[PDB]
Amino acid sequence: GQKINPHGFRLGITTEWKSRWYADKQYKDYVKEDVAIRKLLATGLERAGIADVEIERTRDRVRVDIHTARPGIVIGRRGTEADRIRADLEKLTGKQVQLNILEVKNPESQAQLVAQGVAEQLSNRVAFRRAMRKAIQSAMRQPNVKGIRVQCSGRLGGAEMSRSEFYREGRVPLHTLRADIDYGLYEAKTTFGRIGVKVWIYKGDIVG
Amino acid sequence: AKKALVHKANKKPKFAVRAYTRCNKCGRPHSVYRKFGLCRICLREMAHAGELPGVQKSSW
Amino acid sequence: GQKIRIRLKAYDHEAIDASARKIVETVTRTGASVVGPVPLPTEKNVYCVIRSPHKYKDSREHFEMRTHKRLIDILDPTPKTVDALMRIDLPASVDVNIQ
Amino acid sequence: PRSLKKGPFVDDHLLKKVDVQNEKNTKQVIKTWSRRSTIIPDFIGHTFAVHDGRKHVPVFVTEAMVGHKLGEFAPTRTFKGH
Amino acid sequence: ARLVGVDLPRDKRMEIALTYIYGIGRTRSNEILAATGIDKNMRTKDLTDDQVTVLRDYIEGNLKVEGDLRREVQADIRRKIEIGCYQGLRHRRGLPVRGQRTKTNARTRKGPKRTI
Amino acid sequence: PIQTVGRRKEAVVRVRLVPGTGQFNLDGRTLENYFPNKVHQQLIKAPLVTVDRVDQFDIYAHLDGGGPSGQAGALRLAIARALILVQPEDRPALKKAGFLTRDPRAIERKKYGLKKARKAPQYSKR
Amino acid sequence: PRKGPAPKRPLVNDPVYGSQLVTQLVNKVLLEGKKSLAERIVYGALEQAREKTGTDPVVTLKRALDNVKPALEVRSRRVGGATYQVPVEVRPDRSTTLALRWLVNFSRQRREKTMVERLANEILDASNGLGASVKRREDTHKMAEANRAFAHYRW
RNA sequence: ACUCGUGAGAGACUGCCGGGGUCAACUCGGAGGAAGGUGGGGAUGACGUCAAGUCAUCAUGCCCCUUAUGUCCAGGGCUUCACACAUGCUACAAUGGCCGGUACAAAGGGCUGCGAUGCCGUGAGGUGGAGCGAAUCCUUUCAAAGCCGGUCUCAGUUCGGAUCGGGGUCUGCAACUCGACCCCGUGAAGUCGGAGUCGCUAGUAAUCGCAGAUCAGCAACGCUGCGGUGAAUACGUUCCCG
Ligand SMILES: [Mg+2]
Ligand SMILES: [Mg+2]
Ligand SMILES: [Mg+2]
Ligand SMILES: [Mg+2]
Ligand SMILES: [Mg+2]
Ligand SMILES: [Mg+2]
Ligand SMILES: [Mg+2]
Ligand SMILES: [Mg+2]
Ligand SMILES: [Mg+2]
Ligand SMILES: [Mg+2]
Ligand SMILES: [Mg+2]
Ligand SMILES: [Mg+2]
Ligand SMILES: [Mg+2]
Ligand SMILES: [Mg+2]
Ligand SMILES: [Zn+2]
């Protein structure tokens, strides 16, 4: 357990909470609902490519912002998917929700989405070295990215002995608190088990 | 956390003292905090994700 | 005369100070007296958890929850000013209790 | 000990049975799972087969046993020695 | 002095001297001396036969001590053993009777370690 | 008025140096009631013995927090600062004797895995 | 102390007697941080000394110190598997440390009812050269002189 | 106006002065300053290692069960006891025990919760409920060690408080197995611990209380944290371990 989660390490300084509310008495109930919402969302738009979910609460208003690579599949042109999700949302939550389905500017700068892309290639029996190098090159071309690291571990290539390989390009200063490190993790599903993909994308320094 | 036990922990028991808390995310019986409704493992994970408002890593 | 106390609570101090400005400005624009944002002591809740899922009772991680507090006492509550305070739009990050 | 405000505790079912038997002047063997009920003086002549977790042990009540719990007379654990 | 069969210590304060009676501890001592009006700070040397008489009269009246008390204690243990209650079986075995640990400790009841 | 604050450990004292003959109103008490220990007395009045104005002042003090020895140390600091206000040219002597330093020594926090801040659990090889 | 000697903490001057020897003595009597108790133990013992000898207590304390301070000491060194007691000179500060430690430790082993009595009597005996602390000094020197041959190690 | 609370900011940089130095790094000392030389302490664990730990938080490949290896319930067990190891706590006392008086904290917790006054109980506690979602009220006006006084007088004791007898309180549907606490009685081993072995370099060790999480209640002497009182010693790198 050698590496502190990059997001949590910077949570007070360089990154921000993925949910905004205040409650004293309702805190436990709010968390329970959040758990339910995020499990309902993480297992719905899997092939849509979700990076972030932000949940805002106040009175009964439940604002859910879903960041996605392409919103096309997250909203049918008839609103079909928005209506289906809002239906299950309000049902579960008990109150009224406003899905603000957004979209990500630079998909290939987004560590969670880069992790999903590597994972899906491994799910489609792509040589893991290929997927690693592809993600590295795509990310480094984009203007903010000053460095990237990608790590895949598990039964790589279907072998019986676990391997943990990593490729790195540029700077990835994990120990620097002011360094803006974007972290993503995704679990690729394969005939021989699960292989974990971690991505660290350094995008520069924040002073506040 | 066998699903039967998770459901039975959500039912009203016939005696008030049979009620016990289980982690809302995974069902773990031990080390469930009252204010969060989560076990120590889920607490650590969610707090690192920033999914618990106001909860941050503590140093002093 | 009648007095209204606004207790403001938040987790981030930046959100709490920003929302103490918004209220003080609204009250000044409606001409009432505002005692101002008095800073109350922060509450600190501390949690200690075992890092590993099993058997490593000497590896721990401390977590913190700070709650910042600001008291705003508004004197001379003109009914227009009361209506304004009820119609201010404030972030969900900030809890406003009005008395 | 159970506080005197509440009096002695006896499982409602158990009570019912012993009452009936002593009301109809009869001393039958009463099958009981209730380890936790106190011996009331009403029990003095009755015989109880009380569960020890494995079987029912015959307990014959006596004057000197009143106010003890029924489970005190059916040992749970067996230890012959090492 | 001589009190209910017990020789009180040579020169001990009264509140301590009375605890040498098998039925009397420090609380009952202070009680008895308050009711009899004898100064608890007195030495046993200075105790007069008249005071000894008032002492014997009070504690033989209100209190059960010495043999009477020992017989009652033995009778209470014997009852438990006879009726076959759980505590009685524990007395037979020479093991803790108040649900204490036996895997370790329990030496006061078990005696010295007979290592195997 | 002359007012100054001295701090030591978790004790804050507020001294009011006024002209007098060597009297202390430590929360309403003299320097023998509040601080019976002779060592504490020698400590509180040490700055005055360096200036030589042991009987040239009265002191009024509010003592809060910490304990007897912390409050004694906070007092000595407060007084020494008050002397700097009364007569600035005493600063070379008072600081040379070290009375103007705020002693930063505070209780070290207890660390997890340990019994105290440094005391470790008993170790065994096997 | 692989990187060199560490600084010695300044000792204050006793308010009642004005010897730093006295406050050093209280820091040896000190148990469990109960300094006020150790303080009055030492003050009481010096008063018992003052009344029994008539003379100034700090002066007799210094005299008893000078009769129990070791000048020469033995340090053990393994050399060729054989273990040799090596005579080494005692630096002045260590001499007084040793003397005071010996005085207090034998006072704790004395027979009188209270520590004030035991400490005062040990101080008085050591002023005359009679006490157990004096015998310890003499035994320390006896072992040094018996090992004079092993001084050539000079470690 | 002093504290204090919490916001913004200043401050430590080998920056300045003297001597060492490759006019080098860096070093020894001095001034100024609250602080001096990464000021003290957290958070932070590189590439790897041990086929270390965890399929019992969770997830998951493959195998197995599906009238059971699923699932509901009552009772019992996880609390056994001739022993052994390990981590602690309380002691063996007078630098103490007991009684009386009296002083000085920090941090934290509280809603079918924390609960003040008064009254009733020797006491645990009862009764009743003021006031507080709390810098407000409750957790006494919040401690103990400490300081003053008296008493015990080196005794297995006025040390010790195990065990066991009797009588109670509270929580809970229910304290037999198997709860904590209180009162009366009882009064064990224990006289500073063999070979050996552990922690600690200053607000440290030692010692003293306080709070919190879990939690109806608690096996809490545990754990996480908070303040009070406060030492000794470090010549040195021959020797042991890494
Ligand atoms: Mg429970
Ligand atoms: Mg007796
Ligand atoms: Mg061993
Ligand atoms: Mg670092
Ligand atoms: Mg293995
Ligand atoms: Mg399985
Ligand atoms: Mg069951
Ligand atoms: Mg167990
Ligand atoms: Mg005692
Ligand atoms: Mg013995
Ligand atoms: Mg003895
Ligand atoms: Mg060190
Ligand atoms: Mg509890
Ligand atoms: Mg401490
Ligand atoms: Zn969980």
Swiss-Prot record, chain C:
Gene3D superfamilies noted in UniProt: Ribosomal protein S10 domain
InterPro entries associated with the record: Ribosomal_uS10, Ribosomal_uS10_CS, Ribosomal_uS10_dom, Ribosomal_uS10_dom_sf
Keyword field contains Ribosomal protein: yes
CC annotations in GO: ribonucleoprotein complex; ribosome
Molecular function as annotated in GO: structural constituent of ribosome; tRNA binding
One GO BP annotation of this record: translation
Annotated keywords: Ribonucleoprotein, Ribosomal protein
Organism domain of life: Bacteria
Subunit text: Part of the 30S ribosomal subunit.
Function: Involved in the binding of tRNA to the ribosomes.
Entry similarity comment: Belongs to the universal ribosomal protein uS10 family.
Protein name as annotated: Small ribosomal subunit protein uS10
Species annotation: Mycolicibacterium smegmatis (strain ATCC 700084 / mc(2)155)
Record gene name: rpsJ
UniProtKB/Swiss-Prot annotation, chain D:
InterPro entries on file: Ribosomal_uS19, Ribosomal_uS19_bac-type, Ribosomal_uS19_CS, Ribosomal_uS19_SF
Domain of life of the organism encoding this protein: Bacteria
One Gene Ontology molecular-function label: rRNA binding
GO cellular component terms, A-Z: cytoplasm; small ribosomal subunit
Short name of any one Pfam family annotated for the protein: Ribosomal_S19
TM segment ranges: none
GO biological process, one term: translation
Gene3D superfamilies (alphabetical): 30s Ribosomal Protein S19, Chain A
UniProt keywords, alphabetically: Ribonucleoprotein, Ribosomal protein, RNA-binding, rRNA-binding
HAMAP family noted in UniProt: Ribosomal_uS19
Record's function text: Protein S19 forms a complex with S13 that binds strongly to the 16S ribosomal RNA.
Assigned protein family: Belongs to the universal ribosomal protein uS19 family.
NCBIfam families per UniProt: rpsS_bact
Protein name in UniProt: Small ribosomal subunit protein uS19
Taxonomic lineage from the root: Bacteria, Bacillati, Actinomycetota, Actinomycetes, Mycobacteriales
Swiss-Prot record, chain F:
Originating species: Mycolicibacterium smegmatis (strain ATCC 700084 / mc(2)155)
GO molecular function: RNA binding; structural constituent of ribosome
GO annotations of cellular component type: cytoplasm; small ribosomal subunit
Alphabetical UniProt keywords: Ribonucleoprotein, Ribosomal protein
Superkingdom as given in the UniProt entry: Bacteria
Recorded family membership: Belongs to the universal ribosomal protein uS9 family.
GO BP term, example: translation
UniProt protein name: Small ribosomal subunit protein uS9
Disulfide pattern: none
Residues of the full protein shown: 25 to 150 of 150
Curated annotation (Swiss-Prot), chain G:
Top-level lineage group: Bacteria
GO molecular function: rRNA binding; structural constituent of ribosome; tRNA binding
UniProt keywords, alphabetically: Ribonucleoprotein, Ribosomal protein, RNA-binding, rRNA-binding, tRNA-binding
Keyword rRNA-binding found: yes
Pfam family, one: Ribosomal_S7
A Gene Ontology BP annotation from the UniProt entry: translation
S-S bonds: none
InterPro entries: Ribosomal_uS7, Ribosomal_uS7_bac/org-type, Ribosomal_uS7_CS, Ribosomal_uS7_dom, Ribosomal_uS7_dom_sf
SUPFAM superfamilies cross-referenced by the UniProt entry: Ribosomal protein S7
GO-annotated cellular components: small ribosomal subunit
Family membership noted in the UniProt record: Belongs to the universal ribosomal protein uS7 family.
Oligomer and partners: Part of the 30S ribosomal subunit. Contacts proteins S9 and S11.
NCBIfam families according to UniProt: rpsG_bact
PANTHER family, per database record: RIBOSOMAL PROTEIN S7
Protein role: One of the primary rRNA binding proteins, it binds directly to 16S rRNA where it nucleates assembly of the head domain of the 30S subunit. Is located at the subunit interface close to the decoding center, probably blocks exit of the E-site tRNA.
Name of the protein: Small ribosomal subunit protein uS7
